[model samples]
Target: MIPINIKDFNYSDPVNNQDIILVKNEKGSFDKGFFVADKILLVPARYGNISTDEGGITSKKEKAHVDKKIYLETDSEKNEYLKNMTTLLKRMNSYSTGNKLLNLIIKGEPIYSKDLQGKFIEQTPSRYLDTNTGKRRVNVMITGPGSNVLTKKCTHNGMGLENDPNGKHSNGTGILSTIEFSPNYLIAYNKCVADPVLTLFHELVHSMHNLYGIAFPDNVKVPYNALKDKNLVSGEEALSEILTFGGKDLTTEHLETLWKKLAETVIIVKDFVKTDTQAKDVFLNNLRFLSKNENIKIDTIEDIVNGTLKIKNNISNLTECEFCKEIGDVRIRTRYAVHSEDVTPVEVVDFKNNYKLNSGFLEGQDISKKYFITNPPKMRRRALRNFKCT
Candidate 1:
């Protein structure tokens, strides 16, 4: 005899399908098929508490808040969100290449597709396979600012991660290609953060890199210096090679340079990098990751901040920047015999020349933020292996 008859059981489980229960509203609005977390998602993001000394560079290794979790949301604005992404991807598709920044963007990639029900759904491409040859599906989640999808202290325009099958990462599902995007940092100048294309471009490259890395673990391993044309090349070498040559511009000198950079990174991310556990927070994280070589000089955090501010002001169509404008006070100067056609002494001719001679100061370029430090190539490598690739 059976312990309990099947007829006596009703499949009424409140916890089993909570979302459907909550969606019984006046408007039968069903956006997607999968589960969307209404509550703040506890995602394990890389946070290397950035040290806010207002000083330049901090090489001291800081703590990693890995065990702790941060909150992220799917964003309240969902419709215009997907459409905006769709439009942006259309513009970005033509500009992608594996040799460009973050491989210039991954080729033949679509932002989304329709499910069997003809509803908008995510894409699971065939090229990206795991150890079991399973297709890694791409999922896009747009969150709001302070979620750290690039802006303020933490520097990253977008974030991408591969499947984590084992207990290494968040869910251990190990079959989803998730890209996080929070379109903030709307700087009017610098143009980098103004539009979301480049930001999207970086994440695409990361998606491709991480997917490929997981798909072929052996191929994605790292940092072993080798001779290129009888010259020993290091991490920076391949980085320069790849960034210098776009997809169409892969000269005979740089075709293999792209792969070279990947090999140097994920399998083994070089110095100035946080370890796996040390990558969770950047608010007070150390900047020692910036300078692996003791001799190489680096910028202070304050330098980066002030430089960023000055740059933002300088690039705007509105107000001018005082710091950026201070440099013109010193330029090419000439005396009376030096400029007979223009007139007499350089100072007597015009205030421009007079100031140049009087100031006697050659102002150097203000320290620009190492926006490049948080760029995709290095960060993508971090994705390929583990969060921290020391």
Candidate 2:
């Protein structure tokens, strides 16, 4: 099956039969279709194991508990539940113009297009395929202890795999386009259909990057360099920092805003990087703009604690601590200065005269050591690939 970006599908009409599905085991509810989970299911959540000394632990008291919940109901209860859930699924599956396309698919009856249905119908145990052409279809299969036997030999050849901070990343995977996971239990985000839908879209973006190699420019040299040859950090680390650091949340409204902003930024930067000299300048300017723009600010720990951040915050405090300075500098450099070279050396400039804000703010921070460690910034491999013509 072709792997489609959540962006490729138009989620305007629910009856289109192509909306992405967020399936859980349930018979019926006022929400989308549900499958009855007979066992435990692991779902990734934004909040990781809290109650630790980790600086990235934004919400220590709010870590999602591993509930030993079950979808137990009598035959009569099951029928009624399914009916209600189907009705809800039909409504939830209905279309809206938004940043991401999501469809809730629990269990029973196919909710997507015939092509996808046909693939699922093959009943290939533990194996799912993407049928879309010109892109790798995401294949999800279950192996390991409780998974299908055939998937044991499955080889994950994709290069961009990363752990999901949501905590549900079990033996789950996305092939060219398909995402598959062995259902252990059906615990979606607070039973909110929209939450899982958003999570699905995030994974879809990762698969899209893998399949189509959609590169995001990364001239922010510092983080890029630190990421190179380092297993402790990843592109997702930096990208999530950029995307969520600002005040952006994953609300239906905010996602719609991000859709427009990302589209606009992509177009402007895509056009900007067409020439050689314009490339670095465009990259730096965009990075600076991203760092400063409050409209696109990354979700801070403070925001997460206050419930302003919708996307679950991942654990990357060291990365955040380092990148926070990059964000501040990018903002200042882009708005006031011409380029990095124009800025006064950190040592030579007096804090009061240079920053013109507060000596406390300048003295309180120390990135000299950070810059010294991750010297010679590295660019994300995918980001660099976009400039292949140059």
Candidate 3:
């Protein structure tokens, strides 16, 4: 008889005989087939006990609430859910540009907060109360190691699955570590009842952003500063959304038109702060240069938002630009930029240097190598040995 922990039996795929489970530490029977979870089963069980500065009237007994238990559904339901998730993941991997993404998914474990019960679960700690209102709500989140956690060696660090004495998860120092999924969202996705893949893809984009040293801080004040500042949160989100759903197969001409549409959307919404506007401006300015070689009329942001923007159906329409060739590849840059009349050659150098400094890599360091390595390259040899640079 084989002893199996129920938690390990989460994801199911036909290729693996549907018996594989994600484990944190122990090596199971099908080790290679299974991935490890850094931290598993985070729950929002402490909601009632969450501290507030509103005086001592809220006694420990008064603040107590019943803890909730999440369980896997019946075998048929569980199997179907796993099968769908596995299939989607496989498809995404097939279409992906690099193996790092697939590798990351295989290795990074899922943090499940909700289950088959259709109830809300919080994975990360939250001080804000869950008002049923749109302003404040409970949802799954992807987060990094806390400041204290960063002080210690984390197992998820790209460094050899061992503790590095001086490692940090800060910009350019270390990598972003974990993902927490909303159980409700997963259940919906599994049932084909909702479109949460976009959100999941968005979060995965964050992980990629962290790996590339382009993640921004949450509090960055200026949009251009955030855009220029590596590791700021908003800029990362905007860029991630743009890359994930915006212009994948579009030609250089159509792609620029799409970016221009986004820029116009930014202007019309005016919901974002002035800093975001500046960041959007820089991003738009950069796109102008990248797409300058092609001649095309810009379209309205409304067309894009409404899904009515005209896009060329054939790849033959693409026109290659010398700027992209001269600068290696724009696709490789975490944030794409190019040299044009407005953005001169020297400004491009300044932009690259600014990114490098914020990322904290050594000067002249192969930015890609250090940025993607699990640990600082100085600390470990053969970092990211599993990944091949294309």
In the range 1-390, model 3's lDDT, one tens digit per residue, is: 111122333333332422232222121112112221221122211111222222222111111111112212244433433433333333233332222333332233222122366343333222111221211121122321121111111122323223321222212222433453221221111112112233334455445433322223222222323235544322122232333333232323322343333334334322232334443343233222222223332245463333212221211122212212322322222222111111100101122222221122223223232222222111111111143687
Q: Per-residue lDDT tens digits of candidate 1, residues 1-390?
A: 111110111113222332212211112332131122221111112223322232232111111111111222233233333333443443343332312222211211222222566443343332221212222322222223332223312121222345222111111111223454533222222211123444454444434333222111211212323343324222222222122212232224332223332223222221222332332122012111111112222234444444323322322211111111222331211110111121110001111221121221123111122121112211101111125665
What RMSD does model 3 have? 26.0
Stretches off by above 4 angstroms in model 2 are 1-62, 67-93, 96-157, 160-196, 215-390
Candidate 1 TM-score to native = 0.27
Model 1 has an lDDT value of 0.25
lDDT winner between 2 and 3, please give it: 3
Please list the C-alpha lDDT of all candidates, in the order they appear: 0.25, 0.23, 0.26
Q: Using lDDT, give the best candidate's number.
A: 3
lDDT of 3: 0.26
User: What is the alpha-carbon RMSD of candidate 1 to the true structure?
Assistant: 24.4
| TM-scores vs. true structure, each candidate | 0.27, 0.24, 0.27
Candidate rank order under TM-score: 1, 3, 2
